[PDB]
Scaffold this active site. Structure first.
Site, mmCIF file in Angstrom:
data_model
loop_
_atom_site.group_PDB
_atom_site.id
_atom_site.type_symbol
_atom_site.label_atom_id
_atom_site.label_comp_id
_atom_site.label_asym_id
_atom_site.label_seq_id
_atom_site.Cartn_x
_atom_site.Cartn_y
_atom_site.Cartn_z
ATOM 1 N N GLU A 11 0.741 -1.326 0.022
ATOM 2 C CA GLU A 11 -0.005 0.098 -0.023
ATOM 3 C C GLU A 11 0.700 1.371 0.025
ATOM 4 O OE1 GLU A 11 -3.712 -2.179 0.355
ATOM 5 O OE2 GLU A 11 -3.108 -0.112 -0.085
ATOM 6 N N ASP A 20 -6.731 5.984 -4.570
ATOM 7 C CA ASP A 20 -6.032 4.695 -4.555
ATOM 8 C C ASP A 20 -6.143 4.112 -5.825
ATOM 9 O OD1 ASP A 20 -8.999 2.838 -3.109
ATOM 10 O OD2 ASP A 20 -8.782 4.060 -5.088
HETATM 11 K K LIG Z 1 -2.500 2.468 -1.611
#
Ligand SMILES: [K+]
Ligand SMILES: [Cl-]
Ligand SMILES: [Cl-]
Length: 164
Positions: A11, A20
């Site tokens: 992430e 995202d």
């Molecule tokens: K991310």
């Protein structure tokens, strides 16, 4: 290697609100704020999450606080989902981590939707599960990451995260 380091690799870490892979407002270590296209709405979620009036920027410490909550929540949910708990219980610790990762990324619902792949995992039919997992929107939209997860499910080793 462990679930935290693994997800930290997948992430990344950003202290300012960003979007995202799906285009949604997020911050920290993959902490999804909202699916809303409204930046204000995302900022309001962030403030609620942190407990202070932030202006869209948080500290590393805060980011990690959210991340711990997120991981914990991912595991908690797996354990409360009848479609996933049995799978999780049937696996060794390394493969369980891959399952946590998947759920953190796509949510419980999304994950429990991999019924057939999960069933192969439960049967310990590693290669077949691996082939099956790849046949999904998940794999197509985030192929590098999906490949990593898949290799972990297939091998029960952290090799794919070795060197990142
Ligand atoms: K991310
Ligand atoms: Cl939260
Ligand atoms: Cl990817």
């Amino acid at each position: 290697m462990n679930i935290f380091e693994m997800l930290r690799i997948d992430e990344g870490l950003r202290l300012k609100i960003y979007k995202d892979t799906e285009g949604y407002y997020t911050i920290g270590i993959g902490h999804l704020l909202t699916k809303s296209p409204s930046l204000n709405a995302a900022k309001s979620e962030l403030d609620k999450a942190i407990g202070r009036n932030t202006n869209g920027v948080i500290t590393k410490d805060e980011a990690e606080k959210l991340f711990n909550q997120d991981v914990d929540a991912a595991v908690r949910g797996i354990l409360r989902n009848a479609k996933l708990k049995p799978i999780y219980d049937s696996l060794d610790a390394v493969r369980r981590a891959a399952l946590v990762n998947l759920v953190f990324q796509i949510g419980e619902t999304g994950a429990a939707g991999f019924t057939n792949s999960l069933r192969y995992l439960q049967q310990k039919r590693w290669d077949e599960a691996a082939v099956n997992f790849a046949k999904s929107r998940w794999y197509n939209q985030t192929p590098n990451r999906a490949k990593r997860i898949i290799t972990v499910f297939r091998t029960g080793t952290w090799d794919a995260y070795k060197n990142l």
